[PDB]
């Protein structure tokens, strides 16, 4: 039956989401921190979307990567038509959800992906970081503190639940995030920030020797 | 069921990959070395893709040959739009994987092919050779030392594991590669190099009397 088929599809999607590297995103004093478990040096699961909007994903690389590209596309055209400060994390979070739902209903296989869109305030302004999680069906959830995506999310989510502290510095939030992620080695870690203090482009990767010194 | 069908497709693809001539690609002092077991004199499994990017394949000739052509196509147009030094082995390796995955999902029969894209540094620059292996599904793997494609890959991969030496000269790497490939005769061998010392076009075939003298 159709209902049975739908249930099977949901189970398949869940399985796909489960067998994947884990990513975390959490708010800290200077903005938002993305920490993903990533062995490759070329393939990335964290990306700039717009001036103050970042993006992390977990699942099937070609698909989440494809969404990455679609999201980049929409923001630039919108900004050119109206302006940079008009594109918000909210509008982008919304677009992905609608697209995912329609796509799943009309396509063959559902995207085994889990998305997190992050936004911080502009330069010289005060506002709390916003985290949204978009799931494979189109559901969207507003997160106040942290998002955990891919793999087994329960232990990481609980460890973060005990260790999280608002207004933690960059080093403390990095320790908390790596610790809860372990529930690792300097190599194979993809770390980036949405630094609210930057004048325009807030996204900034933290790689190599500096990262080693921090950890 | 669909899952069962997918499993059957994977098995069929594996069988197709298995019944084929073996190719090896390995890093040596002057760049990268391709050594394939090829009886025909007209049909080739090793090819120039761009100035410093080479390509080897194993499977069904018409298909791997077709990818060869598609890859050649993309690089020239890209270079004309931006420039020669902008096309990299990484971008090409990526394109094939995405295309293969989409193609397999929407087509009838999966491409019974296995690809290896190789890149060396430009003239007067220092950088390690990069080898990527792209499999029939779209998976891509970053190889530090050597790639073995087609046929029974275990014995060749192990023999190379014992014999490999970084910064081996051209003759030593040729002996190692032919020896591990045997796990043959002067005739029916397709040998080419990505010589990092060439000014622009790095790909260069090694055929006939010179090859005989070397071996």
């Amino acid at each position: 039956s159709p209902e049975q088929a739908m249930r099977e599809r949901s189970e398949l999607a869940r399985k796909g989401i489960a067998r994947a590297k884990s990513v975390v995103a959490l708010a800290y004093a200077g903005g938002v921190l993305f920490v993903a478990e990533n062995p490759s040096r070329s393939l990335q699961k964290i990306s700039e979307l717009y001036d103050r909007v970042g993006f992390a994903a977990a699942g099937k690389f070609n698909e989440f990567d494809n969404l990455r590209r679609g999201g980049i596309q929409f923001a630039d055209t919108r900004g050119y038509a109206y302006d940079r400060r008009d594109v918000t994390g909210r509008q982008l979070a919304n677009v992905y959800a609608q697209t995912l739902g329609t796509i799943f209903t009309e396509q063959a296989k559902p995207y085994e992906v889990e998305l997190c869109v992050a936004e911080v305030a502009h330069y010289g302004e005060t506002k709390r970081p916003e985290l949204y999680r978009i799931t494979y069906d189109g559901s969207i959830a507003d997160e106040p503190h942290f998002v955990v995506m891919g793999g087994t999310t329960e232990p990481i989510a609980n460890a973060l639940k005990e260790s999280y502290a608002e207004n933690a510095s960059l080093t403390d939030a990095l320790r908390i995030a790596v610790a809860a992620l372990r529930a690792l080695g300097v190599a194979s870690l993809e770390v980036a920030v949405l630094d609210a203090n930057r004048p325009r482009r807030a996204f900034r990767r933290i790689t190599g020797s500096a990262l080693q010194a921090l950890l | 069921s669909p899952e069962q069908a997918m499993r059957e497709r994977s098995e069929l693809a594996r069988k197709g990959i298995a019944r084929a001539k073996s190719v090896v690609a390995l890093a040596y002092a002057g760049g990268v070395l391709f050594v394939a077991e090829n009886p025909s004199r007209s049909l080739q499994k090793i090819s120039e893709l761009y100035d410093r990017v080479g390509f080897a394949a194993a499977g069904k000739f018409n298909e791997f040959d077709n990818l060869r052509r598609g890859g050649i196509q993309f690089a020239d147009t890209r270079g004309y739009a931006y420039d020669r030094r902008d096309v990299t082995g990484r971008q090409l390796a990526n394109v094939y994987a995405q295309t293969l995955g989409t193609i397999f999902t929407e087509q009838a029969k999966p491409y019974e092919v296995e690809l290896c894209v190789a890149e060396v540094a430009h003239y007067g620059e220092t950088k390690r050779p990069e080898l990527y292996r792209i499999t029939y599904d779209g998976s891509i793997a970053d190889e530090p030392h050597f790639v073995v494609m087609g046929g029974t890959t275990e014995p060749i991969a192990n023999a190379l594991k014992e014999s490999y030496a970084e910064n081996a000269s051209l003759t030593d790497a040729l002996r190692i590669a032919v020896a591990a490939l045997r796990a043959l005769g002067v005739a029916s061998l397709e040998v080419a190099v990505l010589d990092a010392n060439r000014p622009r076009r790095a790909f260069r075939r090694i055929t006939g009397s010179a090859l005989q003298a070397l071996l």
Binding site: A20, N38, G59, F61 | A97, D137
Partner: peptide, 4 residues
């Protein structure tokens, strides 16, 4: 393949 290439799950991540």
């Amino acid at each position: 393949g290439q799950y991540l």
